[model samples]
Target: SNAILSLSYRGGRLIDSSGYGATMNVGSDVIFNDIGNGQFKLNNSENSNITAHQDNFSINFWVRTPKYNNNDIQTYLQNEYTIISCIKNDSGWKVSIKGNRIIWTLIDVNAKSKSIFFEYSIKDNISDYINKWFSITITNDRLGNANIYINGSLKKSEKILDRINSSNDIDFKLINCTDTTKFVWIKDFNIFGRELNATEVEERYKIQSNTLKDFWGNPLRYDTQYYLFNQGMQNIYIKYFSKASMGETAPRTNFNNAAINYQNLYLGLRFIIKKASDNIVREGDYIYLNIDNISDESYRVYVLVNSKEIQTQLFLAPINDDPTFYDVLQIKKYYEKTTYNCQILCEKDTKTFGLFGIGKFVYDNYFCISQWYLRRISENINKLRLGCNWQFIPVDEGWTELQ
Candidate 1:
């Protein structure tokens, strides 16, 4: 099924819009249990639906250059075949990708001759990639020539050994490796077929992102897509018609920084069917948010259901106090059987905010298919977790429990 997985740190936990879901790995202080450290991962699983093409492929994502340990470089996407990450040694910052065991000496900490494998280099633009919203696209057809892009601008093009082949079995890793850590904020992890092109790559980086409309327009825009809304404020307001997915890390040039404008976010979701027969008109079915203030005050989620024109409203209440937890909000009905624009206007006026993600269920059911209650996760600190054998914890207002 065409689905999406998104995460925001509302209520202090990771929640996705798919209403679906990991983790067993303890490494260095590389991956932190914080808002920005976590994104989606496609890891070592044969059943991952998305295939790892062994011949040709392209990868895209949004990431701020991470703070590097003098020795350990931060890693972004890794599998047995290829690795994309940042390396900082005694010198400074460098972005590199390596295939096979091919080693091309690059600049790092210790030796001027410190040998590290990099098929491409934009080390001169290091400052532009750090602490700002930047998009990178790497595409190669094993033709020995690979192209790289930064925020829609071409950074480098290099010829390769053509010998490096990443494992089709290797999973897509997000942060922290077994021996190192990547301290950075990332969102919108995407992949394209080896036969993907470039013009669309530049377009995807400039404005459009990973979503239904994005990939539908061009294969190079996004094949497998994820989104993080770039709206940053105490409260925000927007109108949503058609299928819309928003999160935190994809749009913002600054991560919760910059001068302020507003507080509390207002959103309007229009679930209109071009035809009632147009039931499955959705490109991607889930939404996610991870903001701080979702639970700070008594809030309202006005539910005006089953209509084309959008009606009045009603909402649930804050079940608790702590707001670090990710709030999982739901309602009674959605399309297929009905219509509701969910014309919502959010209003919050304080500096206290949390991470967030807000959206619909993937399988097309009533919001009441599942209910949310509260739980608290008080134990583990400063650790990154990933795996299939994962479990849940509690929060002040975090988690979806009870009815």
Candidate 2:
């Protein structure tokens, strides 16, 4: 059930010679070493079983480069007439293939100090980075198709180039450049010759982390868990109330500029009410929920469309002596297109008389907001769309009273 491909250095030895199998020495220089710091190397000779090209190949390792070397070679493959290396150039990290004169850099960024996991695909000359620690994996097939995985999550992909032979007369090197001087520290190194499916990659990384060493480590399992729907529902709550009598508007609490985008716009609420009595708001009143005692005049929620507020809704709610009787209202609407900056407003009234409770509105929808999960399902409908329903239900979990 463990899906990750397990690999270890066979012909390679640690450079540190500390007997911990922790470091490696390259080119008679201690400058290149993995100090429990995650740096190592692997090489292949003509008689070695190391084959660079296969139906699939992948490399997963951790790295930290405190400085940049434009001419430094991170990882390289050189044959009789071609050279391909994952290099750090003035632009960024690149995968350079000399035969095609093609160079692929993982990405270009404004100089900011950070650590990342690097993955390269020889077939396509493309690369990706795992911005965070957590097992990273890269898999490629001879067909030039490749994928990058971070913490077992697929980050990106590109089309593999053609005319590149897998069995090139080149050597595969890890961490060090061709000249044998520049290098990086690596945490865990894993490479595979077989193309691993998504489930296998995830499970392998999970197991390696020991975070969930057991099958039940996760409350949800790939086979046991069912995909309920392509989209899920989310609920938004806004509450507003006042302790003193003031007239202007009770201010919106929950639904001022609160909005979500997916398949459609579900609802927007704008309710306003006035104060009934200037009472030190009773126990059951919503005012007791105040975590802060800030003045209401400065508390207003603004709603905007494309950063512009097109409409405003204001309301007030009052308390009754019975404590059981509380006032609340909500508005519902639907739209087909996505809207940005659809704003919300909650402001205090200018009139001061009896204590007023600002009216609050709750917003609810059934569309999933994460595009990654959505796109994943969309790309593989047969794998995910076998049996599912399109209906949704709203449950009242003691948060609101139904009128």
lDDT of 1 at 30: 27
**TM-scores of the models, in the given order?**
0.30, 0.29
Q: Candidate 2 residues 1-403, lDDT tens each?
A: 2223322334344222223233322333222232233333332222211222213556555432211122222332231111122223222222322211222333323332212223333222111211112345666666655676766777666554212223221122332234333232234554455777689887776555401011111111111211111111112212233432221221212311111111111122222212222321111222211111124322222211111211212222233233222222111111110110011111223311112212222342111111122223454452432111111111111112112
- Candidate 2: lDDT over CA atoms? 0.28
As for model 1, its CA RMSD to the true structure in angstroms is 18.6
- Candidate No. with top lDDT: 1
Which stretches of candidate 2 lie above 4 Å from their native place? 1-12, 15-25, 30-54, 67-134, 142-144, 167-183, 210-403
lDDT tens digits by residue: candidate 1, 1-403: 2122333333434434333342122222222233232443222222211212223556566654332222222222232222332233323212332211222223333434323332322222112222233566655555545666656656566654212323323123432233322223345545455534667776666453321221012111111221211111212222321132221111112112121111111122212112111112233222222222333543322222322221111223333334432233221111111111111121122321211223233432111111111112333311211110110111111011122
* Each candidate structure's count of clashing pairs: 60, 43
RMSD of each: 18.6, 19.6
lDDT of each: 0.29, 0.28
